[model samples]
Target: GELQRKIMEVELSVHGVTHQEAQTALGATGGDVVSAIRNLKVDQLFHLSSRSRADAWRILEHYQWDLSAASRYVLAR
Candidate 1:
């Protein structure tokens, strides 16, 4: 639990995202740091993507910003 906590902390510091958000990503990827980085990219990129405000909000709201899922959702659109 300590290790997971520390990982979340590091992820939080590095990515400036929430701990739950970090955990969502890390949990899905078996706590892989590299994968977490990619997850962060998906999240950040989604925010920066050329979508309308309503569309972005819908994705974020619907998926809770789960990186991989959100990317796929956007790509499939």
Candidate 2:
């Protein structure tokens, strides 16, 4: 877990990337520098399309600012 926080910090300072953004990328690409970038930034554009920003963003914390990640939770509510 030495890199757990370092990894998160790196991406966060890079471009105002969210702590959750880095966390989510970790889930998809744990230690892959390139793949982690791809996973983090590539999916950045899928918001709003994932669901209503109003509902999603409100609870986005649980989803790590990932409106896309909140789709199911919002709808399932």
Candidate 3:
């Protein structure tokens, strides 16, 4: 089952992930999946995203999350 697991893992790590947050981001941007993900990856979409962890955490702290809060938070499934 390694191959199957690997395939699913790839899907999981790709843009337009079928989760609610990602889907919402895409929907909010008029169905551009790459744009949605890049928005998240480059600190342009939601309350998250940054090319640098330091900057991302800066925003997080600005919003009142502790250093570990982002890492330890739970995403809705």
Candidate 4:
């Protein structure tokens, strides 16, 4: 199982985000590193929102933090 674990570590390093973030991205993208990269970008965009952390995270949770879709929902209401 070292290879599987190694891949997760490599994914984490390549994305330069927390392990949890990388895991979420990896899961969302079905273990594809390139797609995980894009997933992390959207996650970072959610973090970059000017709103308070609590509020932003709440919004993200509600919208599943899907960047484009979340932004539209957040802006509309």
1-77: candidate 2 lDDT, tens digit per residue: 65775576548633446876776676676666556654443344335236444444356556765534554554664
Q: Give one digit per residue, the lDDT tens place, for model 1 in 6-65.
A: 566647543457776777777777877767755555566457666765666567557765
lDDT of 4 by residue, 3-44 (tens): 377447635544247777777777776777666755564555
Of 2 and 4, which scores higher on lDDT? 4
Candidate 4 residue runs with Cα over 4 Å from true position: 1-16, 51-77
lDDT of each: 0.63, 0.54, 0.46, 0.60
- As for candidate 1, its clashing pairs are none
* Per-residue lDDT of 70 in model 2: 51
Residue 66's C-alpha lDDT in candidate 1? Answer: 61
Using lDDT as the measure, the top candidate is 1
Score every model by TM-score: 0.48, 0.40, 0.34, 0.43
What shift in Å separates residue 49 of candidate 1 from its native position after superposition?
2.8
By lDDT, the better pick of 1 and 3 is: 1
Candidate 2, residue 13: CA error in Å?
7.4
Q: Model 2 — which ten-residue stretch has the worst lDDT?
A: 40-49
Assess candidate 4 and give its TM-score to the true structure.
0.43
Candidate 3 clash pair list: 43-49
Candidate numbers, best lDDT first, in rank order: 1, 4, 2, 3
